[PDB]
Amino acid sequence: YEMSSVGVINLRNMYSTYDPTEVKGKINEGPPFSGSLFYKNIPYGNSSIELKVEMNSVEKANFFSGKRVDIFTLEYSPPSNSNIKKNSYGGITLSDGNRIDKKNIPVNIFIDGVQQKYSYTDISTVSTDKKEVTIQELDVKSRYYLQKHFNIYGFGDVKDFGRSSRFQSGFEEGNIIFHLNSGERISYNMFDTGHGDRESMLKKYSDNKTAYSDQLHIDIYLVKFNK
Numbered sequence: 450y451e452m453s454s455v456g457v458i459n460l461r462n463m464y465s466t467y468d469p470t471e472v473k474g475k476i477n478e479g480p481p482f483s484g485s486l487f488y489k490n491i492p493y494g495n496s497s498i499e500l501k502v503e504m505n506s507v508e509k510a511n512f513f514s515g516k517r518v519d520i521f522t523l524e525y526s527p528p529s530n531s532n533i534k535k536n537s538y539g540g541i542t543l544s545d546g547n548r549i550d551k552k553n554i555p556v557n558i559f560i561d562g563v564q565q566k567y568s569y570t571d572i573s574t575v576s577t578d579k580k581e582v583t584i585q586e587l588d589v590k591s592r593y594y595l596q597k598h599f600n601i602y603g604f605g606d607v608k609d610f611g612r613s614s615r616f617q618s619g620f621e622e623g624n625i626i627f628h629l630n631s632g633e634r635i636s637y638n639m640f641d642t643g644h645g646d647r648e649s650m651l652k653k654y655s656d657n658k659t660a661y662s663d664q665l666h667i668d669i670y671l672v673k674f675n676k
C-alpha cells in the first residue's frame with residue numbers, strides 16, 4: 450500500500466500523532482530569503498534543526514523579518530537534506546502582545562449532519578494560547594482530535610465507525626470549515642492527499658492565514674462511507 454497508495458499513508462501519518470514543531474518568541478536569523486525565513490537551533494529528533502519557514506509572498510517574509518514570532522507548524526524533509534535542516538510552510542504569528550491563557554475554539558463535529566460528542570475539558574480539546582492564531586495550528590489540533598476520537602484516517606483505536614473506506618476507516622469524505630467572524634469560510638477537504646507527498650499537502654499553509662481565536666468557530670462535516 451505504501452508503494453501504490455502513498456498519499457493515504459502520508460496523510461494518515463501527518464495528523465495521527467501530535468508532535469508539531471513549535472517555537473515561542475523567536476526572531477529569524479539574518480535577512481529573509483525571498484518568501485522564506487530561517488530559525489536556528491530548534492530542538493528536534495536526535496539534536497536540533499534549522500527551520501526554513503516558507504510563505505507565499507515576499508511581502509509576508511519581509512513583514513515578519515526581525516520581529517519576535519511564535520511558530521506552530523508541520524515540517525518536512527528539504528530538498529535533499531540534511532537531518533538537521535527542515536522546511537515548513539507558514540505557521541507564524543507575531544509574539545508581541547499576542548499571549549492569552551488557553552482559549553477553547555468552538556467546535557461542532559457532524560457525521561452526515563448528525564452532531565457528535567465533543568469534549569471541551571480535555572488536553573486535546575482544540576485550544577490556543579494566542580490572540581491571533583494560524584488556521585494551520587487549529588487544523589493540526591482539530592484533525593488530531595478527530596483521529597483520536599473518530600479514527601478518520603484509520604488504524605486508530607476507535608472502531609465505532611468501521612474500516613471500509615480507502616483510509617481503512619469509517620470515512621473518506623468530509624471538510625473542515627473555519628468560519629471567521631467576517632463571514633469568510635475557509636474550507637479544506639480532510640481527505641485530500643495532494644500529489645501524494647507530504648510537502649504537497651502542506652503547501653496550503655503557505656498563506657499563513659490567521660484568525661482571531663475568539664472570532665471563529667470550527668465545523669467538521671464528515672460523510673460516512675457506504676460500500
Ligand SMILES: [Mg+2]
Nearest residue numbers: 628666667668
Ligand atoms: Mg458554522
